[PDB]
Write a protein that binds this ligand. Structure first.
Ligand code: 0Y2
Ligand code: 0Y2
Ligand code: 0Y2
Lengths: 243, 244, 244
C-alpha cells in the first residue's frame, strides 16, 4: 500500500482492495477526481490521465513531475523545527494567499497540507486558503512518497478540468475510475452527481468501462441504476459499468 | 400478533402493546393515518373508519377488500424469480407510473413495496413513484395477510382525505387513534399542532382520542392537555391520551 | 464545589478545574455571559462584574441580591407536592408571561426552571417563555445555593447588556472570562463570535487578560489564533488564554 504525499486526511486506504477487485484491465486509467492520488499510486497501468478542478493540486503535481529534485529540496526547508508554531503557520498562509509564483505556492501548499488542521484543503468566499493551525506533534516530511509519486508521474498527464472534460478524453484502450464528492447522508450538486452517471452510460455504450465509488443510499442507487452494484463495508457502493 | 401485508414505515409494531394498553373501548375505531394498517389488524372494534391522504394506498385497500380473489391471483404472478432483478424492477416501475388502470396499479404497487429499497413509498416532484431497486435475497408474497386484511376489511370503510375531514366523521360511539408523521429531531409543524387542537375539540364532545409520536419538547408542547405516557426502547415514544 | 441554584442542560461544572487552572489572578473578574453563575460561585475575587443579555436572569439575580429572605420565602411556597403537575405548570407559566411585576416573575422563573423540560430557558417569537412540563419525579428546592448566591452577590454588580458593553468595563486590575454560546456543528452569530475574539485582542493589547471557552473546531481555532490554546478532553473543549 504505497502512501500519498498528501493528507486527505488520507483518508483512507479502505476500499482499495475492493476497487482493484472490480477495476477492469486496460492501457490507460482516467481519473476525473484524482484527489490524493491513492488509486493511481496503487495500480499498474501503462498510462494515466488524472484531472481535478483544484488548480493548486494540478500545479503541485506537474511541478513534482517536472522539477522533482528542485521541488524536494525547497519543500524540505520548511519542515525544520523553527517553522512549527502558530506564528509561522499564519505568516506562511498569508504569503501563500498573496503569492503569484506557482513554484513558491506549491512549496507552501505542502507545508499547509501537513501542518494544518486535519490536512483539510479549504477556501473562503474570497477564494483564500483558510484552514487554521493543527498544532501537530511532529510532522513528517514525505520525502519517499514525493519521489515515488514522481517516478510514477512519468506516465501521467495532469489537467485542471471538470469531470465532463476529463471524461471526454477516454478512448477504447481507456478505463475510467470515478471518485466524486460523496452523496449526502459552493460544492458539488446533485444535478452534477446525476450528470456523472449519464456520462458513464454514454461511455459504456461506446465500449469504454467505468467504475464509480460513493456511499450506499437511495439517491445513489437511483443514479447508478444501469450498473452492476456491489456493497462493501455507513456502507460504500461500487457501481460498475462493464461492456 | 398479525402482520400487515405491506412493509411498514421504519420498523414498528412493538408499540402495539402500549397502544392496546392505552386505547379506550367503544364500537368504532377512526384512524386518520392508517398506513400499513397494523393497529386495525391487531385490534377488535366492530367497525373501522380508515383514512389516509395517499390515494395509491386507499385504492389498493379498496381493491383488496372488494376484488379479493382476482387481486391475490394476479399479484402472485409477479412474485417469481424472473422479476427479482433491476432490469425488470425498473420496467415495472415505469409501467406503474404510466398506467391509468386502477387494478393493474394496485398490483404493481405491492411488487414495488416488496422488491423496493427499504419498502419505502415516495414520490418525486412530478408525482411519480421514486424508490430504487432494493436488492433483496428473495421477497415474500404476503398471501395469508392479504386474506386476513380482506376478511377484516368487511367491517371497514376506506377514505382518501385529510386528518381534519376523517376526524370529523367520529361520533358518540367512536374512538380516534392517530399516528401522524413523526415530529422532528412533507407534514408541517402547523399541522402537527392543528392535530392536537382537533383532538382537544373531540374530547370536549366526549369522544376519546389517543395520539402517538416521538418524545420531544414540541410533542410535549402540542399535547399539553393529555395524560402522557413515555415508552422506552433509538429514543422514547410518546402516547397521549385525551380522555373524558 | 458549590452548585448554582439554577438547573442547566449539560455543563459549566465539568470544567471548573481546568478553568481555574488557567484563569489569571486579579482584583475583579468580569463575565460577559454569567449564565448560571458557576465560575463566579467557585472562585475568590475581591469584586465581580456579571452580565447577560437576558433580562429575566439579571433581574432574578438583582432581586436575590437585595431581597434575600423575602425572596426565599415566596419561592418555597411553590415547591410543594400540590404543584408537581401539568395543570399547575401551565397555569404558572401563563401567569409569568402575563405578569408585569418583577418580584412575582422571578419567583415563578425559579419554579419554571426546576419543573420544566431539561431546565431550559426558551421563548417564542412573541417573547413568551415556551418550555413545557418536564414531568420530574421530584424537584429540589435549592435553599442552601440561594443563600450562598446572595452572600457572594454582595461583591457583585449585575448588568443586562451585551458582551461588548460588559467587556468595555474591564480595567488595569481586571480579569475577563468568556463563555459564549457554543460554536456550531435569532441566536448568537458567527460574526459575533469572531467579534468577541477581536475585543479580546484589544483587551490583552491593553494588558487586560482574557480567557475564553468553547468547542474545539476548525472555526474556534480560526477565531482564537492569537491566544495560547489548551485542549481539554471530555468533542473536546478549547480554552484560549490571552495573557500579557
Ligand atoms: N466539478 C468537479 N470536477 C472535477 N473535480 C472536482 C469537481 N468538484 C470537486 N472536485 C474534486 O474532487 C476531489 C474530491 N475527492 C477527494 C479530495 C481530496 C482528497 S485528499 C486531497 C488533498 C488536497 C485536495 C483535495 C483532496 C473527494 C472524494 C471522497 N469520496 C469525499 O467525498 O471526500 C477533490 O479533489 C475536488 O477538488
Ligand atoms: N395530511 C394527512 N392526512 C392523513 N394522512 C397523511 C397526511 N399526510 C401524510 N399522511 C400519511 O400518513 C402515513 C404515515 N405513516 C407512515 C408509514 C409509511 C411510510 S412509507 C409507507 C408505505 C406504505 C404504508 C405506510 C407507509 C405514519 C407512521 C409514523 N408516524 C412515521 O411516519 O414514521 C402515510 O401513509 C402518509 O401517507
Ligand atoms: N449577545 C449576548 N450578550 C450577553 N449574553 C448573551 C448573549 N447571547 C447569549 N447570551 C447569554 O449567554 C448565556 C450562555 N450560557 C447559558 C447558561 C445557563 C445555564 S442555566 C440558565 C438559566 C437561564 C439562562 C441561562 C442559563 C450558555 C453557554 C454554553 N456554552 C452554550 O452555548 O450552551 C445565556 O444565558 C445567554 O443568555
Amino acid at each position: 500500500k504505497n502512501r500519498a504525499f498528501l493528507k486527505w486526511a488520507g483518508g483512507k486506504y479502505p476500499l482499495l482492495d475492493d476497487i482493484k477487485r472490480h477495476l477492469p484491465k486496460g492501457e490507460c486509467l482516467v481519473e476525473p477526481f484524482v484527489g490524493a492520488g491513492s488509486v493511481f499510486l496503487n495500480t499498474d497501468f501503462s498510462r494515466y490521465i488524472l484531472a481535478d478542478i483544484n488548480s493548486d493540486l494540478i500545479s503541485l503535481y506537474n511541478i513534482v513531475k517536472m522539477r522533482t529534485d528542485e521541488y524536494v529540496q525547497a519543500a524540505r526547508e520548511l519542515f525544520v523545527p523553527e517553522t512549527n508554531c502558530a506564528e509561522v503557520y499564519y505568516q506562511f498562509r498569508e504569503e501563500f494567499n498573496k503569492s503569484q509564483d506557482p513554484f513558491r505556492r506549491a512549496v507552501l501548499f505542502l507545508y499547509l497540507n501537513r501542518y494544518g488542521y486535519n490536512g483539510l484543503c479549504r477556501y473562503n468566499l474570497r477564494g483564500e486558503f483558510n484552514v487554521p493551525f493543527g498544532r501537530y506533534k511532529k510532522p513528517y516530511f514525505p520525502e519517499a512518497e514525493l519521489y515515488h509519486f514522481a517516478e510514477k508521474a512519468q506516465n501521467a498527464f495532469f489537467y485542471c478540468e471538470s469531470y465532463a472534460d476529463s471524461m471526454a478524453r477516454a478512448d477504447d484502450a481507456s478505463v475510467v475510475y470515478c471518485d466524486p464528492p460523496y452523496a449526502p447522508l459552493n460544492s458539488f450538486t446533485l444535478e452534477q452527481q446525476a450528470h456523472l452517471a449519464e456520462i458513464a452510460e454514454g461511455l459504456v455504450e461506446r465500449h469504454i468501462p467505468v467504475l464509480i465509488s460513493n456511499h450506499d443510499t437511495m439517491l445513489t442507487r437511483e443514479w447508478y441504476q444501469r450498473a452492476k452494484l456491489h456493497v462493501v463495508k455507513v456502507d460504500e457502493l461500487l457501481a460498475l459499468y462493464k461492456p
